[PDB]
Design a protein around this ligand. Structure first.
Ligand code: HEM
Ligand SMILES: O=C(O)c1ccc(CO)cc1
Ligand SMILES: [Cl-]
Length: 393
């Protein structure tokens, strides 16, 4: 009843151009079986949204990667929020929700927006830049580690550790084992900065440690929650911002609309998150026998959700291949959906909005003037290099 496909969604050929294979996954049926890795797969919006909103049946405590924690040892101590289910997930989620709260965005927005404008002005003085290294990477690295309260030393480990984490979500291919092989220095840095004495006061990290006396988290749980913000926060935001610049360069009409109405910046970033889906895939594990899309999935089975394919499903999105900054993006699963929906989505949207606002007000045109290079990751989609020319407005 379930179609069996030999597509490896973790191969270099797939990462190079995933969209033809993603249609094959969607059109094959609501639930497919991937013979290459012995997992179930869902690529349509309806089933992906269903799995995300049923954490009782499709749990995360057995790992959101290919590895089943009930069967294999996790390469690192499990995340207290990402790899946890209710009720254990509830209170650590509430702490991160209050640390990355709306009231916290008001305290950092002016500094984030000013740094976004200062970066664009600096890039306009060079003209020909790398929109990845000099914009997509350079701007979040200039606001987020400071907002975290991290010291200046060792910040070169942040992005390598982020790519290691998302590579480790994948199957035991060469991408994952090479990353884990080179992991020792990045792990040592990240784990050390999670300790309270190493976090500057007022930052996100110190605020997490300050939440240890409410009864929601304990002091021994605080370093792991800080590790969450050092694992998944930078690279996907970089990939999202880098995707927006990419889209604005490939769809010059949308850049012209954004220039005419800079208030579209927040939705221009949200649509970039839907269009690119920096987090392409995540796993869930069935805690019981479940029927989904007419298929009976046994207990203890890994289910692979194609978030990027769910964001391009024509059963849900009109013209899903088109970057539209005025599209009603409400409902996309680029940040997940349900109890695990990205708790740091306000930080990412703020970083993305003020950067696109700075571009909308200062840049007249973005023209690719060099070889575009893609960075391959088991979980993340993003560019390695985006050589662009920036014309001042
Ligand atoms: C474009 C930017 C981002 C994207 C695309 C993204 C993507 C995602 C997705 C899809 C999930 C759901 C995981 C799941 O359902 O298993 C998630 C969860 C999470 N994200 Fe993000 N994220 C982004 C930015 C951030 C930022 C800026 C932070 C922190 C400052 C952050 C921290 C987290 C945490 C802690 C979780 C776990 C939440 C939970 O398990 O309840 N992310 N992210
Ligand atoms: O808890 C974590 O370490 C963690 C890691 C990666 C993600 C993906 O956004 C979310 C949370
Ligand atoms: Cl670690």
């Amino acid at each position: 009843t379930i179609p069996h496909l030999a597509i490896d969604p973790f191969s270099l050929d797939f990462f190079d151009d995933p969209y033809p294979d993603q249609q094959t996954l969607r059109d094959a049926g609501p639930v497919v079986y991937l013979d290459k890795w012995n997992v179930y797969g869902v690529a349509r919006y309806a089933e992906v949204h269903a799995v995300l909103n049923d954490p009782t049946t499709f749990c995360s405590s057995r790992g959101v990667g290919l590895s089943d924690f009930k069967k294999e040892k996790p390469w690192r101590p499990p995340s207290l929020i990402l790899e946890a289910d209710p009720p254990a997930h509830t209170r650590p989620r509430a702490v991160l929700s209050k640390v990355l709260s709306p009231a916290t965005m008001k305290t950092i927005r002016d500094g984030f927006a000013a740094a976004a404008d200062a970066k664009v002005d600096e890039l306009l003085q060079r003209g020909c830049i790398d929109a990845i290294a000099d914009l997509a990477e350079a701007y979040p690295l200039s606001v987020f580690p400071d907002a975290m309260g991290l010291k200046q030393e060792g910040r070169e480990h942040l992005l390598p550790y982020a790519g290691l984490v998302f590579n480790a979500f994948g199957p035991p291919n060469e991408l994952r084992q090479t990353a884990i092989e080179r992991s020792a220095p990045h792990q040592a840095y990240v784990n050390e900065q999670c300790q309270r004495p190493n976090l500057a006061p007022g930052g996100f990290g110190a605020c997490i440690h300050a939440f240890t006396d409410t009864g929601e988290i304990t002091p021994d749980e605080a370093p792991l929650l800080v590790r969450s913000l050092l694992s998944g926060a930078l690279q996907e935001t970089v990939n999202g911002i880098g995707a927006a610049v990419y889209c604005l360069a490939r769809f010059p009409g949308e850049l012209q609309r954004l220039r005419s109405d800079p208030t579209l910046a927040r939705n221009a970033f949200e649509e970039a998150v839907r269009f690119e889906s920096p987090v392409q895939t995540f796993f869930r594990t069935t805690t019981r026998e479940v029927e989904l899309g007419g298929a009976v999935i046994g207990e203890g089975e890994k289910v692979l959700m194609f978030l990027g394919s769910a964001n391009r499903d024509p059963r849900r999105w009109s013209d899903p291949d088109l970057y539209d900054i005025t599209r009603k993006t409400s409902g996309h699963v680029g940040f997940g959906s349900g109890v695990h929906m990205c708790v740091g989505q306000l930080v990412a949207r703020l970083e993305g909005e003020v950067m696109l606002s700075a571009l909308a007000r200062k840049v007249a045109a973005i023209d690719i003037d060099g070889p575009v290079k893609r960075r391959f990751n088991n979980t993340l989609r993003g560019l390695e290099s985006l050589p662009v020319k920036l014309t001042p407005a």
